[PDB]
Design a protein around this ligand. Structure first.
Ligand code: FES
Ligand code: K
Ligand code: MG
Ligand code: MG
Ligand code: MG
Ligand code: MG
Ligand code: MG
Ligand code: MG
Ligand code: MG
Ligand code: MG
Ligand code: MG
Ligand code: MG
Ligand code: MG
Ligand code: MG
Ligand code: MG
Ligand code: MG
Lengths: 100, 78, 97, 137, 50, 22, 117, 122, 86, 97, 111
RNA sequence: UUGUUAGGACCUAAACUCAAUAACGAAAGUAAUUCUAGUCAUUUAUAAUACACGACAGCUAAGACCCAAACUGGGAUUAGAUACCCCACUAUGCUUAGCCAUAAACCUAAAUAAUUAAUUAACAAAACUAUUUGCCAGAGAACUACUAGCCAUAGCUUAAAACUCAAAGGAC
């Protein structure tokens, strides 16, 4: 049985390295009006806006392309003892993935 | 808390600085996904097993091997 | 108080040792089974609204109870007044969150 | 090919002329806007007096002498004397930060003078004279 | 080694120092060639001599 | 804190200065 | 960039004399202040002066200033609708930004904690 | 030490400017100096009107004189140059090249300060 | 006094928008801090008062600027409720 | 023990420190073209480090050079010389709306 | 005064042992690197080194009490010359009196 | 008198922006420019009856004087207004020497070396150990009386008792 240490070393997330300005594939699982909730394989989903072009194409289950920025949006503020987190990830929707 | 840094990160850091992230998009839902960078690190390791000791030699030779494989590596300084 | 369970920090993101998780999860599931075997009341509790319906659906499937809504002050410390004189309180509370 | 807020540079060649006059030649309207009285003097580019006016000379007195409408009247009066003397374009150097700082320039516009630029010369010492003590209220 | 080199450089530089013999000639060479210390940087930190 | 204890010393010192003046 | 707050307050770490002496603790609150009311500016002030100007010459006789009187009504009639239309729509929408009440409720969903949990 | 003179001279014709620069540098030598270089920066308009020797000046010729001199000579040089009638404004400073451009590795990000107040609930 | 006249604090009127020229002139003097300087130079501010004021303004700027960050940091999470009804 | 355990090392991906637009450059009082890029075109006032973007060290070098240049008959004090009104803009500021 | 004052023709302590080795150096170069074209601080580094040779058994060591005392005797005489011109300098009058007291403390430990 | 002066003289006084900086100095204090002189090694803590300093105000002699300004005079306000507001003007703030030695001289936190768990009287700027000196022992009487020292003479430091009360005080 593979060890947890081995699993982590060869994990896709460990291979990604820093997540800033990386390209990843996500999946839309929830849509509220023109807001798309996209799972890109991380801890937290991201929330993007439906593009004007090919808006109807972005339906639930649609795999898309993204440019990650943060896996979790967090920041300590003046007088805080802990980082405030919004339980959300940061990414830029680039467009649909070609099925090919 | 131990900062998690494997030995491949030295190689991966150079690859991202020289070529950026592979134009192919990462798929983090496939448990066995092999990215363009991870193949670079697998070849760089193979050459290092042969006994090459110069980092410059291993980086330019690995680029040539992937070029023969057909992977499109762009040395984007931008 | 979580640093014992953290395998390390992968570029800012804490990683949780899944070896300690496996050991602790074994104990927690073992305890939850003996409580269920002895016909004890199990209450699932969470306030995450993304998973509110899933957790209420699980409790119904198991045959147990779920409280995923706003928790009234005194629910357990003042149970007799809120629910009635002979209300039986939960024997185990599972906090998914 | 755009308008420049910055004034022409003295000693250079520019295409900007007003009524066949260069920038250095256009007469200057000196407005001293204080918190009590707003004075106005118009001079030629050789520093020769052409018009003079102020809220006091118009006839305002005490607290009325320091209102916006009082300076507006003073500017219109200064324009009339300057317009008679032969002035159509003025460079407005507005000293002071009082109530009739803008009103005096608005009166000059109402009086038939064409402002081409606005300078500010409010005294700002670089370290100078100790000001009078703060008033208690 | 460093101090010996620094002394030798100063000895080479002293060849072109001004003296009473070459004063007038050096003055006219300076007057003929003006110098400029002006230059500007961009938001990218690049010198932009005109 | 209030200045009450300073006010007592304030009056003691003022009254003493006028006694010395007299 | 927020000013530096290192070596400013009077503390046992700081060797030198303090720079800043805050009246109140420097901890972000979970509310925003109630924005103080803003008032508008006079509308049709120029047109009123024009109307009044003509009267002065014509002994306050509306026969001479008929055209100017109609301009004063025109400006007021436009502004009358403008104040009506803008209050009904723009103020209700609050589209551009949040109000103090809406902002504070969002600041309370992710509140600042100066104490350990 | 190594001193850089900044000599603004009266606007004059080259014959007289050259004569003024020979008289000036000779004074530096007479004060125990070792002149290293002479540079011209050109005639230009002064940033403001400087009044020297009962004359108002709007244009002057800017010159630099690099030299060595004892620490005691700096005062004597400035006194003499201020008495010259073709010197608008003499300013002696320590030569900039003696000071070295310091080595830097960018701005270090110092984080927002913490542990300023106790963790007591409010 | 010894400088050249009409270069400093001077604006040019564009197509007869004198009010715009005045409004730009004031924006310059306010942005450059001259307005506050002339406002505070009417009377004398005591050295202790000046230091108390600068300490106050710096602490306010620190708070206001940081408060803006939290507002902008949470601006994105203000969206339609995805989990309405639960 | 375990070959796959992480190895202590300095962060390979650590990002470089940002430098100011005058980092490792010589600020001279005689370079009035560069000094003029950090003053106001209208009043000639020195900009603060929240506008120039300089570090503490280079901000003080520019400040000490503008004052020396202004005091030695090289630079004007009450405005920016009209010659340098066209030079590159390296300060975050907009007088026009 | 004191028996020894460095001559104006002497080289600074950086090049004191370097110029002698160099085969031939111009008069000007020697004058630039002499004590005539240096600050007073350089002339004091030469005064101290002379005294360390004439007193200390091992002039290579500057951390001995005898060497520390010699370092303070040069400063004390330097502060005194300063105070002969700047009669109302209270910071340097403090520096002078504090160095004298420091020497007395070191001389006591040495004894 | 006023406004303008790209006119002249003066060089009195004070140092905008930079400074959203936080450096230097034992403290007091110190930020217009230039140059000269200049801070530096005692293991560390610990000192008076000694030595040297010490904001502001004030004193002595001679100068300076743009502006500010106790006092004083005039105007107003008020029932009164020996005030708050307005005008004028002096001691004084400046310089050269000497004196005085006091501040909410407080960052109300002595200095030094640690420690961050075995640890909330309240509030403030988290708790706490060791070392050495100084200081405190209910409030008022009392920054007082007397004594001694001091360039101080309506002064400073030093500093009680009688007598009165059953509280005063701190935080909430
Ligand atoms: S960041 Fe390097 S000198 Fe400014
Ligand atoms: K205090
Ligand atoms: Mg209070
Ligand atoms: Mg009493
Ligand atoms: Mg307080
Ligand atoms: Mg006059
Ligand atoms: Mg004048
Ligand atoms: Mg020196
Ligand atoms: Mg009276
Ligand atoms: Mg006087
Ligand atoms: Mg005095
Ligand atoms: Mg005392
Ligand atoms: Mg103090
Ligand atoms: Mg006392
Ligand atoms: Mg007494
Ligand atoms: Mg006594």
């Amino acid at each position: 049985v593979e060890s947890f240490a081995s699993m982590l070393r060869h994990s896709p997330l460990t291979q990604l390295g820093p997540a800033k300005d990386k390209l990843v594939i996500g999946r839309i699982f929830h849509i509220v009006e023109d807001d798309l909730y996209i799972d890109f394989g991380g801890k937290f989903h991201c929330v993007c806006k439906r593009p004007d072009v090919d808006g109807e194409k972005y339906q639930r289950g649609t795999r898309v392309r993204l440019r990650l920025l943060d896996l979790e949006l967090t920041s300590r503020f003046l007088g805080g003892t802990t980082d405030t987190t919004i339980l959300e990830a940061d990414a830029v929707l680039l467009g649909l993935q070609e099925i090919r | 808390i131990q900062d998690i840094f494997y030995q491949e990160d030295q190689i991966r850091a150079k690859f991202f600085a020289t070529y950026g992230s592979g134009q192919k998009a990462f798929d983090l839902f496939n448990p066995n996904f092999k990215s363009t960078c991870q193949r670079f690190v697998e070849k760089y390791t193979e050459l290092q097993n042969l006994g090459e000791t110069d980092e410059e030699k291993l980086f330019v030779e690995t680029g040539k091997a992937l070029l023969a494989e057909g992977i499109i590596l762009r040395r984007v300084r931008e | 108080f979580m640093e014992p369970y953290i395998f390390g920090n992968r570029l800012g993101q804490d990683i949780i040792d899944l070896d300690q998780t496996a050991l602790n999860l074994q104990l927690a599931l073992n305890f939850t089974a003996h409580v269920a075997y002895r016909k004890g009341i199990i209450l699932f509790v969470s306030r995450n609204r993304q998973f509110s319906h899933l957790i209420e659906t699980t409790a119904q499937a198991c045959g147990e109870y779920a409280h995923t809504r706003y928790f009234k002050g005194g629910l357990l410390t003042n149970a007799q007044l809120l629910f009635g004189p002979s209300v039986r309180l939960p024997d185990l509370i599972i906090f998914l969150h | 090919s755009r308008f420049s807020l910055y004034p022409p540079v003295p000693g250079q060649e520019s295409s900007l002329q007003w009524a066949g006059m260069k920038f250095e030649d256009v007469p200057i309207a000196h407005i001293k806007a204080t918190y009590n009285n707003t004075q106005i003097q118009v001079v030629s580019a050789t520093n020769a007096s052409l018009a003079r006016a102020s809220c006091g000379t118009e006839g305002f007195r005490n607290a009325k002498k320091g209102t916006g409408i009082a300076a507006q009247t003073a500017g219109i009066a200064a324009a009339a004397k300057a317009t008679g003397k032969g002035v159509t374009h003025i460079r407005v150097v507005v000293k002071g930060m009082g109530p009739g700082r803008w009103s005096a320039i608005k009166g000059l516009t109402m009086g038939g003078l064409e402002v081409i630029s606005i300078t500010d010369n409010t005294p700002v010492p670089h370290x100078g004279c100790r000001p009078r003590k703060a008033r208690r209220l | 080694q460093l101090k010996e080199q620094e002394v030798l450089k100063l000895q080479e530089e002293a060849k072109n120092f001004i003296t009473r013999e070459n004063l007038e000639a050096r003055i006219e060479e300076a007057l003929d060639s003006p110098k400029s210390y002006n230059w500007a940087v961009t938001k990218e930190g690049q010198v932009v001599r005109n | 804190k209030n200045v009450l204890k300073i006010r007592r010393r304030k009056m003691n010192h003022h009254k003493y200065r006028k006694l010395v003046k007299r | 960039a927020t000013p530096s707050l290192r070596g400013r307050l009077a503390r046992f770490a700081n060797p030198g004399k303090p720079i800043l002496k805050p009246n109140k603790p420097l901890i972000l609150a979970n509310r925003v202040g109630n924005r103080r009311r803003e008032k508008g500016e006079a509308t049709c002030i120029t047109e009123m002066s024009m109307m009044m100007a003509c009267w002065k010459q014509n002994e306050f006789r509306d026969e001479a200033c008929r055209k100017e009187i109609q301009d004063f009504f025109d400006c007021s009639s436009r502004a009358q609708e403008a104040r009506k239309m803008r209050s009904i729509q723009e103020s209700l929408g609050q589209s551009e930004s949040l109000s103090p009440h809406k902002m504070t409720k969002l600041l309370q969903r992710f509140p600042n904690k100066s104490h350990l949990i | 030490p190594r001193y850089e003179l900044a000599l603004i001279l009266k606007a004059m014709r080259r014959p007289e400017t050259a004569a003024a620069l020979k008289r000036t540098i000779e004074s530096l030598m007479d004060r125990g100096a070792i002149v290293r270089n002479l540079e011209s920066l050109g005639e230009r308009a002064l940033p403001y009107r400087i009044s020297s020797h009962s004359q108002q000046h709007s244009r002057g010729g800017y010159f630099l004189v690099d030299f060595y001199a004892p620490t005691s000579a700096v005062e004597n040089i400035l006194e003499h140059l201020a008495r010259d009638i073709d010197v608008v404004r003499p300013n002696i400073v320590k030569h900039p090249l003696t000071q070295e451009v310091k080595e830097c590795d960018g701005i270090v990000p110092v984080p927002l300060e913490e542990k300023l107040y106790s963790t007591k609930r409010r | 006094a010894k400088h050249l006249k009409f270069i400093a604090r001077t604006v040019m009127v564009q197509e007869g928008n004198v009010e715009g020229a005045y409004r730009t002139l004031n924006r310059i003097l306010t942005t450059d801090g001259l307005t506050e300087v002339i406002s505070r130079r009417r009377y004398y501010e005591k050295p202790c008062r000046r230091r108390q004021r600068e300490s106050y303004e710096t602490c306010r700027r620190i708070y206001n600027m940081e408060m803006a960050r939290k507002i902008n940091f949470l601006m994105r999470k203000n969206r339609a409720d995805p989990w309405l009804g639960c | 023990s375990n070959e796959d355990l992480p190895v202590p090392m300095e962060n390979p991906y650590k990002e470089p420190l940002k430098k100011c637009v005058l980092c490792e450059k010589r600020v001279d009082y005689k370079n009035v073209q560069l000094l003029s890029q950090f003053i106001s075109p209208f009043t000639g006032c020195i900009y603060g480090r929240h506008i120039t973007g300089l570090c503490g060290k280079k901000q003080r070098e520019i400040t000490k050079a503008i004052k020396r240049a202004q005091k030695m008959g090289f630079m004007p004090v009450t405005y920016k010389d009209p010659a340098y009104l066209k030079d590159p803009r390296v300060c975050n500021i907009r007088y026009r709306e | 005064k004191q028996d020894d004052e460095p001559p104006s023709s002497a080289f600074i302590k950086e090049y004191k042992d370097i110029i002698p080795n160099i085969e031939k150096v111009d008069d000007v170069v020697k004058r630039i690197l002499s004590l005539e074209m240096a600050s007073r601080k350089e002339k004091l580094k030469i005064k101290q080194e002379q005294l360390m040779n004439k007193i200390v058994e091992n002039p290579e060591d500057s951390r001995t009490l005898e060497a520390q005392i010699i370092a303070l005797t040069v400063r004390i005489r330097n502060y005194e010359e300063h105070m002969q011109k700047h009669r109302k300098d209270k910071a340097h009058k403090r520096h002078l009196l504090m160095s004298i007291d420091r020497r007395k403390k070191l001389l006591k430990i040495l004894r």
